[PDB]
């Protein structure tokens, strides 16, 4: 019925090259059992999409990591949005949607673009750079904390904290254990910046606190919602932009197409999100007994969704393992799908678009120039170091 596999999707070997194991997971059946961690897994697009779009059956309030909040204490107070189900999810979600609205994008777009162009100009003066530290990390650090309204002091905690959050979604392996044992100072920093007086006027955080009188959220909910943005809003974009740059360096043909038409920048970013899937996995917990892909799952079972695999499922995509910047990407699940689909995706896409636009206009070649170094995280896929040589247009 359901096949049992011994594959550990949280092992370093798996992280180093997940694609053959993801095929094995897909081809074993629509629903698999992972004996290593005692969870169900779905690795094909169809079942992942299905699970994403029925939150009643496959809930989030019992945690979207391995841990079941009904059995264990969460390592930090539950997110009011990610780890909430409707209807408790609905109004905080509505608040964050307005804080990160089309109108908000319109106010910051010029500034986000200028900073991207400035970044690429600065890098071109150096020629040989690390596309991670100097670009993928540097550019979001140059725009997102300011957009949040964070003070300057203590920003060095942001990436450590977010790494910790995504490691903590995983099983209790070494990556997770080590993360939590180092957490205290990053946690203390982030929690403190979530308080209203610590967030600059007009910024994302201040706007969340400004939203505490409409009947949607109360003032005591606002700090945790600022926490959500400080959890998900930086490192994801770093890995997104890094993915895109990695793709353009590996596929020079696509760089040349992008150069010839920079209006393809937004879709080039979208395709990179599909192709590399920064957020690889999330869990759901069953709230009742349910039929899924000919399998019957009992109540209170963890279900692991392979978003990255779903994005490379040949049942859904033609040539899924090719990077194609004119692909019809609509429908990929790199930002999820359904009621929890990434609420900050407009920010992510804005950052990616203007960075790729800047590269499209300013850079003639991106050539890998040193050993590439992958970074391991229980949930995030991305590189630690990507030495490249940039050649100006």
Ligand X SMILES: COc1ccc(C(=O)O)cc1
Residues in contact with ligand X by the rule CB under 6 A: 79, 81-82, 165, 227-228, 231-232, 279
Contacts of 149 (CB under 8 A, 6+ apart): 199, 200, 201, 202, 203, 204, 205, 206
Exactly one of 44, 302, 340, 362 binds ligand HEM (CB under 6 A); which one? 340
Least distance to ligand HEM, CB of residue 96, Å: 6
DSSP string, 258-272: HHH-GGGHHHHHHHH
Q: Which is nearer to ligand HEM, 189 or 204 (CB)?
A: 204
Residue number with the shortest CB distance to ligand HEM? 344
Using an 8 Å Cβ cutoff, are 350 and 108 in contact?
yes
Q: How many residues does the chain have?
A: 393
Q: Tell me if 382 contacts ligand HEM by CB under 6 A.
A: no
4 is in an annotated binding site: no
Query: How many of the chain's residues bind ligand HEM (CB under 6 A)?
Result: 28
Interface segment toward ligand HEM; rule CB under 6 A; list 130-138, 183-191, 296-304, 337-345: 337-345
Residue 240: in which H helix or E strand, if any?
A: helix 235-250
Using an 8 Å Cβ cutoff, are 373 and 116 in contact?
no
Exactly one of 18, 205, 336, 387 binds ligand HEM (CB under 6 A); which one? 336
Exactly one of 39, 232, 304, 388 binds ligand HEM (CB under 6 A); which one? 232
Q: Which is nearer to ligand X, 345 or 385 (CB)?
A: 345
Least distance to Cl ion, CB of residue 8, Å: 26
284 is in an annotated binding site: yes
Strands (E), the chain: 4-5, 32-34, 39-42, 58-59, 128-130, 281-286, 290-292, 295-297, 302-306, 363-368, 373-375, 382-385, 387-392
Least distance to ligand X, CB of residue 190, Å: 10
Q: Tell me if 176 contacts ligand HEM by CB under 6 A.
A: no
Q: Which does 64 bind (CB under 5 to 8 A by kind): ligand HEM, Cl ion, ligand X, none?
A: ligand HEM
Least distance to Cl ion, CB of residue 360, Å: 38
Q: Which does 165 bind (CB under 5 to 8 A by kind): Cl ion, ligand HEM, ligand X, none?
A: ligand X
89 is in an annotated binding site: yes
**143: exposed, middle or buried (Cβ count in 10 Å: 0-12, 13-18, 19+):** buried
| Site pattern 210..229 for ligand HEM (x: CB under 6 A) | ------------------xx
Question: How far is Cα 247 from Cα 33, in angstroms, rounded to an integer?
Answer: 32
The total of other beta-carbon atoms located within 10 Å of residue 126's CB is: 11
Q: Tell me if 76 contacts Cl ion by CB under 5 A.
A: yes
Question: How far is Cα 257 from Cα 158, in angstroms, rounded to an integer?
Answer: 35
**174: exposed, middle or buried (Cβ count in 10 Å: 0-12, 13-18, 19+):** exposed
Q: Which does 355 bind (CB under 5 to 8 A by kind): ligand X, ligand HEM, Cl ion, none?
A: none
Opening angle at CA 95, ends 225 and 114, nearest 5: 85
Least distance to ligand X, CB of residue 350, Å: 17
Contacts of 245 (CB under 8 A, 6+ apart): 131, 135, 136, 359, 366, 386, 388
342 is in an annotated binding site: yes
Q: Which does 93 bind (CB under 5 to 8 A by kind): ligand HEM, ligand X, Cl ion, none?
A: ligand HEM
Least distance to ligand X, CB of residue 252, Å: 31
Q: Which is nearer to ligand HEM, 96 or 355 (CB)?
A: 96
Opening angle at CA 269, ends 386 and 335, nearest 5: 105
Contacts of 163 (CB under 8 A, 6+ apart): 179, 235, 377, 380
Q: Which does 32 bind (CB under 5 to 8 A by kind): ligand X, Cl ion, ligand HEM, none?
A: none
Q: Which does 76 bind (CB under 5 to 8 A by kind): ligand X, ligand HEM, Cl ion, none?
A: Cl ion
Which positions touch Cl ion (CB under 5 A)?
Answer: 76, 187
Q: Residue positions in the annotated binding site for heme b?
A: 89, 93, 284, 340, 342
């Amino acid at each position: 019925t359901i096949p049992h596999l011994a594959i550990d999707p949280f092992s370093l070997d798996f992280f180093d090259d997940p694609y053959p194991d993801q095929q094995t997971l897909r081809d074993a059946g629509p629903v698999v059992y992972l004996d290593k961690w005692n969870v169900y897994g779905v690795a094909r697009y169809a079942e992942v999409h299905a699970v994403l779009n029925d939150p009643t059956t496959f809930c989030s309030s019992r945690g979207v990591g391995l841990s079941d909040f009904k059995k264990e204490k969460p390592w930090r107070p539950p997110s009011l949005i990610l780890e909430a189900d409707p209807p408790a999810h609905t109004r905080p979600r509505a608040v964050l949607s307005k804080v990160l609205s089309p109108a908000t994008m319109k106010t910051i777009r010029d500034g986000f673009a200028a900073a991207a162009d400035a970044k690429v100009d600065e890098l071109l003066q150096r020629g040989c750079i690390d596309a991670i530290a100097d670009l993928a990390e540097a550019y979001p650090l140059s725009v997102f904390p300011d957009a949040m309204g964070l003070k300057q002091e203590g920003r060095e905690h942001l990436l450590p904290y977010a790494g910790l959050v995504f490691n903590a979604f995983g099983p209790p392996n070494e990556l997770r254990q080590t993360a939590i044992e180092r957490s205290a100072p990053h946690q203390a920093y982030v929690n403190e910046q979530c308080q209203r007086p610590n967030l600059a006027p007009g910024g994302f955080g201040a706007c969340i606190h400004a939203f505490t009188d409409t009947g949607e959220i109360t003032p005591d909910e606002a700090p945790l919602l600022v926490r959500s943005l400080l959890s998900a809003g930086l490192n994801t974009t770093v890995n997104g932009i890094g993915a895109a740059v990695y793709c353009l360096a590996r596929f020079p043909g696509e760089l040349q197409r992008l150069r010839s038409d920079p209006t393809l920048a937004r879709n080039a970013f979208e395709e990179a999100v599909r192709f590399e899937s920064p957020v690889q996995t999330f869990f759901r917990t069953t709230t009742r007994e349910v039929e899924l892909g000919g399998a019957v799952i009992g109540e209170g079972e963890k279900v692991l969704m392979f978003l990255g695999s779903a994005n490379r499922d040949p049942r859904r995509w033609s040539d899924p393992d090719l990077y194609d910047i004119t692909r019809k990407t609509s429908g990929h699940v790199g930002f999820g799908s359904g009621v929890h689909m990434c609420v900050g995706q407009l920010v992510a896409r804005l950052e990616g678009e203007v960075m790729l636009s800047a590269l499209a206009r300013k850079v003639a070649a991106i050539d890998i120039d040193g050993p590439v170094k992958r970074r391991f995280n229980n949930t995030l896929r991305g590189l630690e170091s990507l030495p490249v040589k940039l050649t100006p247009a």
